[PDB]
Amino acid sequence: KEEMELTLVGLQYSGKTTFVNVIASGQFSEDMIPTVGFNMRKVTKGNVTIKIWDIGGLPRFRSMWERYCRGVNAIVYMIDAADREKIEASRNELHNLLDKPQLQGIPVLVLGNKRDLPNALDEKQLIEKMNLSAIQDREICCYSISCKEKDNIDITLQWLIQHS
């Protein structure tokens, strides 16, 4: 059980590509261009190799999400924890995504990224504001992280590896 695949989804600007780059290379960067379509990197961690599909989050790519989540070992749902304006759309897209029958039972890790920013929401506020308790068909968990300063990247990885 030592190879696995993950898909990263969530709204534009939430930090999905940053997260992939930090996992693969440790590179954070403040300047980024929105991902067109999808991105992918393969990382090894211990005896686990992980293929990570990093899907664009802009509106015109969101129809891709269901397809790239089919058959994967786990789904990562990325949120900009400091962008309260986007919470409504992010929650709507999440529940819409997890309504698709082909994704039944796939574990989901919701990540409240950018915890380093002042008055970023924490994971328990996000649990409530994203109505995560509606999701009852799968393992589901919510962590506060920061790709910039590396908070909780360790346990994020350990939680995902548990599904290899």
């Binding site: 409530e128 308790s133 999701i135 009852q136 393992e139 506060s144």
Partner: protein, 196 residues
């Protein structure tokens, strides 16, 4: 002070149900856990059960090997599972105790509440809980909302109104295994201050 939270709880209860009644005036449609006012209602109903618990019923932890490296938000974890079991039929208890993803007594209490709402049984359960006053003494301080005779009459009347709605809340989510801030703040166990 020991009852400062009671008006806050009552306003949220009433306000959230009125909100639900106005939104669900198509009236052929079920209230789910994707509705924020339904979750606010649940938080207020959880606050009813939390308010005035003896300190021994507030855990430092909810249970499970769920990693505490994150959750840099430490919250107290009230638990009252055997109080609920005492008034519940064995077939509901059995279903709740065998949930795949709900595995803490915190989760079982919160699942019980949402199941009771789906079944339309909240007034039924409260009548029993208020009839078993000796057992309530083992969970609640004398100043608790549930041990206040008048407020108990308010709550029964409020709960009767719930059968004007059809609930299909999620009662099986792993998210239920640990508390979040809103029910704890509404109950007074944490400061309303902390809400933002």
């Amino acid at each position: 002070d020991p009852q400062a939270a009671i008006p806050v709880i009552k306003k949220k209860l009433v306000g959230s149900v009125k909100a639900l009644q106005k939104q669900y005036v198509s009236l052929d449609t079920v209230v789910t856990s994707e509705d924020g006012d339904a979750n606010t209602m649940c938080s207020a109903l959880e606050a009813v059960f939390i308010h005035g618990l003896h300190a021994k019923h507030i855990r430092a932890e909810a249970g499970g090997k769920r990693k505490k490296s994150a959750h840099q938000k430490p919250l107290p974890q009230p638990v009252f599972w055997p109080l609920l079991k005492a008034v519940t039929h064995k077939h509901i208890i059995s279903e709740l105790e065998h949930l795949t993803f709900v595995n803490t007594d915190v989760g079982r209490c919160r699942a019980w509440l949402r199941l009771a709402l789906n079944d339309g049984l909240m007034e039924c359960y409260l009548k029993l809980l208020l009839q078993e006053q000796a057992r309530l003494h083992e969970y609640y301080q004398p100043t608790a909302l549930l041990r206040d005779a008048e407020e108990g009459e308010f709550l029964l009347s409020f709960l009767q109104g719930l059968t004007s709605l059809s609930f299909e809340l999620s009662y099986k989510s792993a998210i239920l295994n640990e508390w979040t801030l809103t029910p704890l703040a509404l109950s007074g166990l944490c400061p309303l201050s902390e809400l933002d």
